């Protein structure tokens, strides 16, 4: 089997993706944020407090005649930019643009932190990363991949995020027509849970190609690049006024700027990030100083190859015995 679903920003900033969902039977579709930085598929649901609920779609489980309680089971998730939710389980059936699993663990959320109150467009998140890093208690569940795997036909998943655009995640399959040149694979590490592998250095904008290795993760549900504070430093030292500033919270730069594209190595290949990827806009609204899209790791204890780099790529997320991550220009 195979899956297709379009993916589609939240704003005109690209802050993150939301990709239809469908729960339950009948049909219940939630526009989820599709996560290979999580493990949890959670959901603002009939169960969520009401004043906690402010514009999304919910499910509700009574409506679903396949849906059952997990009877026991709790969940409780906080990531890495503070927000958090929490709840009980259920099994039911989901499908994501044509492929189908069926017992698959929907969380339930009975609570959400202010983020995800706020944000009227996201239904909850799909998780993407190892099933290890699941919330699930007293027995971890597994992730839509993890349930769905054996019966793709191709253990895999592709993410081509758009710039300003929609793009499109794959389940299944590698779409030989949506990338360019050939796929450069890299090793992963599952230590951590994470999609985590190596890049072999940097270059800013027409700069020399630093070789050095940046160990970090390819995480769907962060939205900006957190680099080592020396590749930051390098890169906003190119652009005539950028400053960290920490009443803002990181790099900022003048909104009249041309931003220098950005290159990180996968193995011997390139990926290059426009610079007007790394524009994230005014730090607030009308204000003409705007907030970078690569920002320092110094502090999360990761680097992360969130939605500003994965953007500029075609990427395979391989789940083989061994899983690897490829690469490709687009």
């Given at each position: 089997?195979?899956?297709?679903?379009?993916?589609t920003?939240?704003?005109?900033?690209?802050?993150?993706?939301?990709?239809?969902?469908?729960?339950?039977?009948?049909?219940?579709?939630?526009?989820?944020?599709?996560?290979?930085?999580?493990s949890?598929?959670?959901?603002?649901?009939?169960?969520?407090?009401?004043?906690?609920?402010?514009?999304?779609?919910?499910?509700?489980?009574?409506?679903?005649?396949?849906?059952?309680?997990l009877?026991?089971?709790?969940?409780?998730?906080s990531?890495?930019?503070?927000?958090?939710?929490?709840?009980?389980?259920?099994?039911?059936?989901?499908?994501?643009?044509?492929?189908?699993?069926?017992?698959?663990?929907?969380?339930?959320?009975?609570?959400?932190?202010?983020?995800?109150?706020?944000?009227?467009?996201?239904?909850?998140?799909?998780?993407?990363?190892?099933?290890?890093?699941?919330?699930?208690?007293?027995?971890?569940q597994?992730?839509?991949?993890?349930?769905?795997?054996?019966?793709?036909?191709?253990?895999?998943?592709?993410?081509?995020?758009?710039?300003?655009?929609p793009?499109?995640?794959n389940?299944?399959?590698?779409?030989?027509?949506?990338?360019?040149?050939s796929?450069?694979?890299?090793?992963?590490?599952?230590?951590?849970?994470?999609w985590?592998?190596?890049?072999?250095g940097?270059?800013?904008?027409?700069?020399?190609?630093?070789?050095?290795?940046?160990?970090?993760?390819?995480?769907?549900?962060?939205?900006?690049?957190?680099?080592?504070?020396?590749?930051?430093?390098?890169?906003?030292?190119?652009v005539?006024?950028?400053?960290?500033?920490?009443?803002?919270?990181?790099?900022?730069?003048?909104?009249?700027?041309?931003?220098?594209?950005?290159?990180?190595?996968?193995?011997?290949?390139?990926?290059?990030?426009?610079?007007?990827?790394?524009?994230?806009?005014?730090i607030?609204?009308?204000?003409?100083?705007?907030?970078?899209?690569?920002?320092?790791?110094?502090?999360?204890?990761?680097?992360?190859?969130?939605?500003?780099?994965?953007?500029?790529?075609?990427?395979?997320?391989?789940?083989?015995?061994?899983?690897?991550?490829?690469?490709?220009?687009?």
């Amino acid at each position: 089997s195979t899956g297709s679903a379009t993916t589609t920003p939240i704003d005109s900033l690209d802050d993150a993706y939301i990709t239809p969902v469908q729960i339950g039977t009948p049909a219940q579709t939630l526009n989820l944020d599709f996560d290979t930085g999580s493990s949890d598929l959670w959901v603002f649901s009939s169960e969520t407090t009401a004043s906690e609920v402010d514009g999304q779609t919910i499910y509700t489980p009574s409506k679903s005649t396949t849906a059952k309680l997990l009877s026991g089971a709790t969940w409780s998730i906080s990531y890495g930019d503070g927000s958090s939710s929490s709840g009980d389980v259920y099994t039911d059936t989901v499908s994501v643009g044509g492929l189908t699993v069926t017992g698959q663990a929907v969380e339930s959320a009975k609570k959400v932190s202010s983020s995800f109150t706020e944000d009227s467009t996201i239904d909850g998140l799909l998780g993407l990363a190892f099933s290890t890093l699941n919330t699930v208690s007293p027995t971890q569940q597994k992730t839509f991949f993890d349930n769905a795997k054996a019966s793709l036909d191709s253990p895999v998943f592709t993410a081509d995020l758009g710039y300003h655009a929609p793009g499109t995640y794959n389940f299944g399959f590698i779409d030989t027509t949506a990338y360019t040149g050939s796929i450069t694979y890299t090793a992963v590490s599952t230590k951590q849970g994470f999609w985590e592998w190596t890049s072999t250095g940097y270059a800013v904008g027409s700069g020399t190609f630093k070789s050095t290795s940046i160990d970090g993760i390819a995480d769907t549900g962060t939205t900006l690049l957190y680099l080592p504070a020396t590749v930051v430093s390098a890169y906003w030292a190119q652009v005539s006024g950028a400053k960290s500033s920490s009443s803002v919270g990181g790099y900022v730069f003048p909104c009249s700027a041309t931003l220098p594209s950005f290159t990180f190595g996968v193995g011997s290949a390139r990926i290059v990030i426009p610079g007007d990827y790394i524009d994230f806009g005014p730090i607030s609204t009308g204000s003409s100083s705007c907030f970078g899209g690569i920002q320092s790791s110094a502090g999360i204890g990761i680097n992360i190859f969130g939605d500003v780099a994965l953007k500029a790529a075609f990427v395979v997320f391989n789940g083989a015995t061994t899983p690897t991550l490829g690469f490709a220009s687009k």
